Write a protein that binds this ligand. Structure first.
Ligand SMILES: Nc1nccc(-c2cc(Cl)sc2Cl)n1
Length: 294
């Protein structure tokens, strides 16, 4: 776009290259995202436009949608770092619990807002959770999955991670509920605490079986209707559930209680973002300033 000065390539996004750019007219720095091929369907256009109104402090603001020469460019609010990089840079000591709680608290507020408007992310991951020097954290690319389906590989052939994918998705559910985002956030919560990914699957079955080995193979008791799902197989190995005290030490009882509810197999039983915000784990939540060195 002639109105933007591509100052730098930030990285490779799910849909295309993501650039840091400056608007010549306003002078504001933004995140420019190129999306993908035939002419862009009107459905995607209408879906994306609805996102311009989904405004919240914990959601990366969609500034503009530029469709020209049959090409789509999304203009977003720009943040200097993602949670993936921050966790890597805090590996030696791990993110202080107060900051972890603050981030989870803010993330849940963002989900609650989007979910109340029936909008899902469907592909939450450390890579699209952005933070600033003021202690805030925001969800990026919310709603794009519905507009543009999440691919197996990105334009750069990079494999889209399955680490945060909810079990109902892995089992072939055709209709996603807001519960898929709580699952993903639960996995990220566990990762911030232990400093290691919870379920680092490298294939759909490996992902599913890693979940099964930790939470126990799901059955009709804990998940009514699971055996009738598209990709469920009666031949799945039967693993017993591990205690959370072993899965996420040194998370306290409040944190483990909340995580368990965010990781419930049955999407309907899984806690909502709104109910999670009222959980005792957040009784002493604060907003610490993070140590960011840009
Ligand atoms: N909005 C924004 N701002 C800075 C970086 C990004 C970003 C860059 C990626 Cl690569 S994924 C992702 Cl999310 N988005």
């Amino acid at each position: 776009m002639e109105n933007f000065q591509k100052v730098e390539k930030i990285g490779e996004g799910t849909y295309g290259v993501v650039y840091k750019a400056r608007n010549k007219l306003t002078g504001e720095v933004v995140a420019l995202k190129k999306i993908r091929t035939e002419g862009v369907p009107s459905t995607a256009i209408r879906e994306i436009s609805l996102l311009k109104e989904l405004n919240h402090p914990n959601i990366v603001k969609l500034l503009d949608v530029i469709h020209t020469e049959n090409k789509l460019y999304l203009v977003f609010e720009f943040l200097h770092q993602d949670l993936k990089k921050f966790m890597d840079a805090s590996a030696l000591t791990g993110i202080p619990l107060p900051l972890i709680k603050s981030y989870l608290f803010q993330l849940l507020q963002g989900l609650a807002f989007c979910h109340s408007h029936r909008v899902l992310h469907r592909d939450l991951k450390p890579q699209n959770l952005l933070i600033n020097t003021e202690g805030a954290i925001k969800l990026a690319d919310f709603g794009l999955a519905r507009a543009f389906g999440v691919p197996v590989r990105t334009y750069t052939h990079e494999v889209v991670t399955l680490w945060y994918r909810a079990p109902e998705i892995l089992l072939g559910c055709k209709y996603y509920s807001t519960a898929v985002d709580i699952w993903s956030l639960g996995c990220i919560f566990a990762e911030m605490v232990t400093r290691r990914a919870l379920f680092p699957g490298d294939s759909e079955i490996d992902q599913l079986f890693r979940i099964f080995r930790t939470l126990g193979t799901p059955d009709e008791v804990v998940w009514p209707g699971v055996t009738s799902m598209p990709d469920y197989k009666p031949s799945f190995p039967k693993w017993a559930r591990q205690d959370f005290s072993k899965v996420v030490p040194p998370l306290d009882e409040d944190g483990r209680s909340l995580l368990s509810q965010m990781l419930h197999y049955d999407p309907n039983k899984r806690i909502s973002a709104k109910a999670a915000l009222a959980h005792p784990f957040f009784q002493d939540v604060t907003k610490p300033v993070p140590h960011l060195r840009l």
